[PDB]
Amino acid sequence: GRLRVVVLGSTGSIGTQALQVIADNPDRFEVVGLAAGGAHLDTLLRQRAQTGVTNIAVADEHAAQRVGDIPYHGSDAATRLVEQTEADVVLNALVGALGLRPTLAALKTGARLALANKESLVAGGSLVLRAARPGQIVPVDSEHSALAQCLRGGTPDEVAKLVLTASGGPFRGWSAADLEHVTPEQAGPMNTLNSASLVNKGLEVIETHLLFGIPYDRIDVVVHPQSIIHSMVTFIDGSTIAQASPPDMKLPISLALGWPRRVSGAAAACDFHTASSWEFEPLDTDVFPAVELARQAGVAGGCMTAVYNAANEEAAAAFLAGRIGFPAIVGIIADVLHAADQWAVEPATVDDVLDAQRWARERAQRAVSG
Amino acid sequence: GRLRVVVLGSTGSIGTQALQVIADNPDRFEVVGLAAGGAHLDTLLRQRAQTGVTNIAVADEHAAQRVGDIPYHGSDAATRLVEQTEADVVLNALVGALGLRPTLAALKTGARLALANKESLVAGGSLVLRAARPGQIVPVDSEHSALAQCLRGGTPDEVAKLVLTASGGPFRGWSAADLEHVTPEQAGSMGPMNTLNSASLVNKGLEVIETHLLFGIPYDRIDVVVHPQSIIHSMVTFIDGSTIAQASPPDMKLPISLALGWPRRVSGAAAACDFHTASSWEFEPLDTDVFPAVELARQAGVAGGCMTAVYNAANEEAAAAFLAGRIGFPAIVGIIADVLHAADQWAVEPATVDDVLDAQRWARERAQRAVSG
Numbered sequence: 001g002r003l004r005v006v007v008l009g010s011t012g013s014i015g016t017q018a019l020q021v022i023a024d025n026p027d028r029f030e031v032v033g034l035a036a037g038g039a040h041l042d043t044l045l046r047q048r049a050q051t052g053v054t055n056i057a058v059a060d061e062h063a064a065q066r067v068g069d070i071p072y073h074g075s076d077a078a079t080r081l082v083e084q085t086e087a088d089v090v091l092n093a094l095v096g097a098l099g100l101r102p103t104l105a106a107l108k109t110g111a112r113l114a115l116a117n118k119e120s121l122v123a124g125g126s127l128v129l130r131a132a133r134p135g136q137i138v139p140v141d142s143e144h145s146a147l148a149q150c151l152r153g154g155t156p157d158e159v160a161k162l163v164l165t166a167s168g169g170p171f172r173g174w175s176a177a178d179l180e181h182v183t184p185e186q187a188g189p190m191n192t193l194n195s196a197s198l199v200n201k202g203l204e205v206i207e208t209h210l211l212f213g214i215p216y217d218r219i220d221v222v223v224h225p226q227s228i229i230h231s232m233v234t235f236i237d238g239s240t241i242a243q244a245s246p247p248d249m250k251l252p253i254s255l256a257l258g259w260p261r262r263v264s265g266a267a268a269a270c271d272f273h274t275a276s277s278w279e280f281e282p283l284d285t286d287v288f289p290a291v292e293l294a295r296q297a298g299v300a301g302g303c304m305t306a307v308y309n310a311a312n313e314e315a316a317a318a319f320l321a322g323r324i325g326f327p328a329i330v331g332i333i334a335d336v337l338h339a340a341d342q343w344a345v346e347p348a349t350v351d352d353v354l355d356a357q358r359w360a361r362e363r364a365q366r367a368v369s370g
Numbered sequence: 371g372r373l374r375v376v377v378l379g380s381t382g383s384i385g386t387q388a389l390q391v392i393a394d395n396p397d398r399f400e401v402v403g404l405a406a407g408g409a410h411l412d413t414l415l416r417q418r419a420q421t422g423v424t425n426i427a428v429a430d431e432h433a434a435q436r437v438g439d440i441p442y443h444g445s446d447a448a449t450r451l452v453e454q455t456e457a458d459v460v461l462n463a464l465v466g467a468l469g470l471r472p473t474l475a476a477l478k479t480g481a482r483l484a485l486a487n488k489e490s491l492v493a494g495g496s497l498v499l500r501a502a503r504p505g506q507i508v509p510v511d512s513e514h515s516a517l518a519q520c521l522r523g524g525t526p527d528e529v530a531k532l533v534l535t536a537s538g539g540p541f542r543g544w545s546a547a548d549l550e551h552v553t554p555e556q557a558g559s560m561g562p563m564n565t566l567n568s569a570s571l572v573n574k575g576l577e578v579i580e581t582h583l584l585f586g587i588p589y590d591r592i593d594v595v596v597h598p599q600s601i602i603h604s605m606v607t608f609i610d611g612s613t614i615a616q617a618s619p620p621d622m623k624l625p626i627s628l629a630l631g632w633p634r635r636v637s638g639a640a641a642a643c644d645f646h647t648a649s650s651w652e653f654e655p656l657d658t659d660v661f662p663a664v665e666l667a668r669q670a671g672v673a674g675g676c677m678t679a680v681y682n683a684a685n686e687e688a689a690a691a692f693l694a695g696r697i698g699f700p701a702i703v704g705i706i707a708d709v710l711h712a713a714d715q716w717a718v719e720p721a722t723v724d725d726v727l728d729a730q731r732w733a734r735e736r737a738q739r740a741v742s743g
């Protein structure tokens with residue numbers, strides 16, 4: 001078989017690597033669609049030139065007019081490209097809750113969704129799950145890919161704990177007082193910030209619960225600054241199975257596209273002929289409260305994980321524009337969450353989620369103002 | 371659903387641990403037979419009383435007379451017990467190539483063989499494999515238990531490499547010159563020959579051959595790395611560059627519990643890795659200039675047939691010499707290399723158990739001459 005692949009967010013870090021893997025393996029994969037935001041003119045063209053098909057979407061209006069030929073544009077350009085293209089695999093490499101509609105469309109087409117866009121699942125919640133068949137969503141996120149490989153190591157009831165590794169970000173070891181002084185420069189895009197703030201890991205804890213069906217109190221996080229161990233599963237007998245590789249998104253990308261077949265040569269193996277060490281430390285939850293906050297959001301459930309994420313997108317951008325200090329990103333997430341008791345109802349519709357996100361954006365905006 | 375277990379070597383370190391896992395899990399397992407040498411009579415008495423089993427083999431006739439009520443004694447006793455006990459699992463935790471006939475009798479009963487005694491597989495080689503059905507031999511060894519767990523991570527043709535971890539023993543990092551002064555006590559939780567085989571790296575050589583025989587993976591894809599914590603017990607690297615590893619604080623009850631109940635895991639068998647406190651897992655290469663045992667094992671394995679039985683028998687003899695104080699530490703493996711490079715004839719497949727025993731005899735006698743002249 002030669003699987004048909006739509007790449008959403010193809011001008012991005014993940015999309016590009018994905019494109020490299022596909023190009024490297026013509027016999028297994030073919031690109032048949034590319035969606036971007038329009039902000040990276042050059043790349044998108046150099047990308048069309050190399051593919052074969054001009055089946056493409058651009059979000060920004062001013063931007064898509066600067067090119068032409070473009071089958072789809074508008075804020076729902078990405079979503080439309082999914083509905084009308086035929087595929088075996090849809091790779092959602094978009095960023096933010098804006099990936100939610102194409103996530104939802106991807107699932108209706110009955111193709112595999114290789115999910116990089118964790119925010120879609122995080123906001124989506126039970127809604128996105130209801131839209132999927134067992135094993136239709138295959139994670140691209142290196143931790144969740146690692147977990148998926150390690151879970152072949154037993155049966156569901158033999159699972160005791162899922163153990164997430166985290167890099168710790170660039171402020172690993174810093175005091176709360178050290179965090180006051182953090183600049184956009186030191187924390188650097190929205191993906192790098194989420195890492196630095198550990199909001200990313202919070203998102204990943206939520207994504208673990210949704211993907212694998214494991215209680216929040218059995219999802220651990222451990223700081224591993226080498227990022228070679230990508231995550232681990234601890235089983236009931238005391239055994240732990242772990243996945244390791246030098247960090248390289250091509251490995252998890254490859255596995256998600258060709259699941260369950262492994263893609264030969266996708267990435268380099270650990271070198272066990274050269275001395276190395278793998279360190280572990282506890283995450284400082286006093287100084288980095290974002291993870292506990294995500295658990296609290298997750299347990300509450302319903303639309304609350306939408307609120308968590310939406311508050312972040314708003315607070316994080318506001319930090320990037322110099323409008324707030326670094327510790328205020330999560331301070332604002334918490335304030336918003338503390339006031340959101342109403343959104344702990346299950347999202348019946350797409351619009352239930354969009355309402356919660358609107359609510360949270362505007363709540364976060366006001367705390368930025370105040 | 372209750373599994374009947376014969377434990378060979380019950381009084382030893384593995385056997386004791388196995389009896390504890392069994393006593394902790396009476397719904398899952400039942401001891402139905404015990405075999406021991408006769409050197410630990412208090413222990414054996416206590417096991418008879420705790421398990422209620424009188425189906426016991428004792429190798430030493432005089433010891434069997436002292437304990438009393440022993441149905442099987444003599445060197446063939448353990449074999450006889452296996453042949454004459456209905457069981458679902460035989461746990462062979464004997465030490466050395468003397469485990470060989472019990473191993474073969476066990477496979478012939480059609481019971482699962484939970485193999486702790488790696489020397490009977492190393493020595494029997496293809497003869498043992500011909501007597502086995504797929505999945506019948508299940509590893510108790512911590513490294514191989516790990517590999518079997520990690521192999522669920524792919525399909526056979528997705529494996530690039532099997533990687534065995536080594537503790538490195540008490541002389542990890544030492545030089546060739548340093549090893550010259552090693553004494554029987556420095557080379558001294560396991561038995562005496564097993565601890566010595568760890569210190570000399572022969573154990574790891576044996577484990578390389580055992581990996582090959584158990585998993586049918588070529589020697590050129592079986593690697594070794596030194597990992598001093600012994601938390602990662604072994605790993606598999608896949609064709610896509612991904613590595614899957616199995617990790618736990620070192621404790622044999624884990625792999626024991628898993629071999630008995632394979633493929634079902636046993637709840638609470640051992641402690642899990644705890645990350646509430648900072649730690650590190652280290653890796654370093656092994657220096658073959660200093661510890662040639664492993665490369666030498668790979669060479670014996672590639673030559674095949676009775677060559678692995680020669681490697682092990684030479685060791686059993688040369689190691690015994692070292693403990694009796696008759697040779698220097700480095701000559702254990704020097705003597706194995708010399709016996710092996712002279713054993714051109716033994717590279718033929720054994721047709722019968724007698725081929726293996728002849729090979730062993732020849733290796734032992736040549737080793738003993740090297741200890742002498």
Ligand SMILES: NC(=O)C1=CN([C@@H]2O[C@H](COP(=O)(O)OP(=O)(O)OC[C@H]3O[C@@H](n4cnc5c(N)ncnc54)[C@H](OP(=O)(O)O)[C@@H]3O)[C@@H](O)[C@H]2O)C=CC1
Pocket residue numbers: 008009010011012013014015035036037038039040041059060078092093094095096098116117118119140141142189191249
């Ligand atoms: N970076 C990584 O390696 C990892 C990231 N992730 C996840 O992967 C996802 C994407 O990551 P990554 O590729 O690095 O992100 P990037 O920011 O590098 O790329 C984002 C992509 O989305 C496009 N885009 C931006 N705005 C819009 C819009 N309004 N409509 C449609 N498309 C738009 C961009 O196009 P353009 O910029 O040309 O406008 C670009 O192609 C995220 O959800 C993240 O959480 C998780 C695992 C690892």
Ligand SMILES: NC(=O)C1=CN([C@@H]2O[C@H](COP(=O)(O)OP(=O)(O)OC[C@H]3O[C@@H](n4cnc5c(N)ncnc54)[C@H](OP(=O)(O)O)[C@@H]3O)[C@@H](O)[C@H]2O)C=CC1
Pocket residue numbers: 378379380381382383384385405406407408409410411429448463464465466468486487488489510511512559560561562564622
């Ligand atoms: N211990 C460990 O942690 C590990 C061990 N292994 C392997 O498992 C095997 C067993 O090791 P271990 O338990 O440490 O060994 P021990 O020396 O602790 O135990 C040896 C057992 O065999 C019995 N025995 C000795 N001689 C004879 C004989 N002639 N006939 C019948 N029974 C005899 C002993 O009885 P007696 O009471 O007379 O001494 C004792 O029960 C070895 O092959 C070893 O390499 C593998 C993984 C790790």
Ligand SMILES: O=C(c1ccccc1)N(O)CC[C@@H](c1ccc(Cl)c(Cl)c1)P(=O)(O)O
Pocket residue numbers: 141142143165166167168169194195196200201226227247248249
């Ligand atoms: O999955 C990944 C990833 C993994 C490897 C390479 C790139 C991204 N991420 O989520 C990126 C952020 C995580 C991460 C993971 C690995 C590395 Cl090498 C880095 Cl710098 C960051 P985080 O633990 O700091 O939150």
Ligand SMILES: O=C(c1ccccc1)N(O)CC[C@@H](c1ccc(Cl)c(Cl)c1)P(=O)(O)O
Pocket residue numbers: 511512513535536537538539559560567568569573574599600620621622
């Ligand atoms: O499988 C085991 C074992 C593992 C853990 C605990 C006891 C024995 N062995 O073969 C014993 C010897 C091996 C070993 C393994 C782990 C440890 Cl903690 C030690 Cl001290 C020795 P070796 O790598 O030194 O050869």
Ligand SMILES: [Mn+2]
Pocket residue numbers: 141142143204
């Ligand atoms: Mn990640």
Ligand SMILES: [Mn+2]
Pocket residue numbers: 511512513577
């Ligand atoms: Mn071992």
